[PDB]
């Protein structure tokens with residue numbers, strides 16, 4: 001597996017959950033500031049999301065500052081999932097692309 005690309009054109013994406021079904025039977029709650037971070041830090045937005053006032057555009061890499069906004073938004077109740085590129089859905093057979101990997105070099 002190696003990053004060798006051009007933005008892989010296949011946009012099939014994963015949606016990262018901000019809520020979990022069962023610590024206590026059923027009660028929706030905001031995931032931890034950590035796990036959520038793990039899921040969306042420096043990722044590439046598959047589709048555009050308008051949340052608290054700002055228009056996170058498509059393909060934008062979300063900084064930790066941005067993944068700090070989305071939670072602040074899920075706190076308010078504006079989003080329950082997040083559209084985002086990922087290696088699980090890449091088209092580059094042997095390899096992964098810039099937009100699907102993300103930030104973290």
Ligand SMILES: [Zn+2]
Nearest residue numbers: 008090097100
């Ligand atoms: Zn890709």
